[PDB]
């Protein structure tokens, strides 16, 4: 049985790298897309999306927008867009990794 995408973001946290935790559901599995301050965020080797290993018997996926030492220039509103054939689910969060004189 196929169902629409669902999405949620969690407040950014600093581990080895900074991470904006996300959880997404849907089947077909939605395609992820990020926006920084409303405009598309191009992933690079320093800012990229990362999924954890899939759990048995579940369609729900967990992961992080991973930021390798971001600076005040990465402070802003992060939107995760999850899309599949039913439409799109969206979740946003404000993140501050550094002040900025």
């Amino acid at each position: 049985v196929s169902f629409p995408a669902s999405v949620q973001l969690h407040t950014a946290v600093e581990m080895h790298h900074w991470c904006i935790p996300f959880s997404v559901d849907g089947q077909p599995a939605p395609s992820l897309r990020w926006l920084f301050n409303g405009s598309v965020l191009n992933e690079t080797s320093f800012i990229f999306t990362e999924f954890l290993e899939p759990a048995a018997n579940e369609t729900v996926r967990h992961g992080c927008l991973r930021l390798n030492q971001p600076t005040h220039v990465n402070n802003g509103n992060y939107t995760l867009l999850a899309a599949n054939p039913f439409g799109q689910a969206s979740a946003s969060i404000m993140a501050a990794f550094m002040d900025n004189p």
């Binding site: 969690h10 581990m15 080895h16 954890l52 967990h62 992080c64 005040h72």
Partner: protein, 108 residues
């Protein structure tokens, strides 16, 4: 909230914190001499207020085998160029600034 990442993510053995330092006035040079840091500098034009990127230990280490090792986190440094007053004249010199936070091992 409870997210799988708090358990399955990649953590640091030592926690740090990065900030931008623009009120630095003294620092030690590569000769270990204490030197004065210019608040500003200027490239064949206007002035760039001198700012520095610093990372130090955030207020033993995580994941250490405490049966054979003692441990502690500590701030290490790096050498970065800067406009300084050598105690005589203005010069571009390498000064010591905080740059990371690492774990130190010592046997038990």
């Amino acid at each position: 909230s409870s997210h799988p990442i708090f358990h399955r993510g990649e953590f640091s053995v030592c926690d740090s914190v990065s900030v931008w330092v623009g009120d630095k006035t003294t620092a030690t040079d590569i000769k270990g001499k204490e030197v004065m840091v210019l608040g500003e500098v200027n490239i064949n034009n206007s002035v760039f207020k001198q700012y520095f990127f610093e990372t130090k230990c955030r207020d033993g280490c995580r994941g250490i085998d405490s049966k054979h090792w003692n441990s502690y986190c500590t701030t290490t440094h790096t050498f970065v160029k800067a406009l300084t007053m050598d105690g005589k004249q203005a010069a571009w010199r390498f000064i010591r600034i905080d740059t990371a936070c690492v774990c130190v091992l010592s046997r038990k």
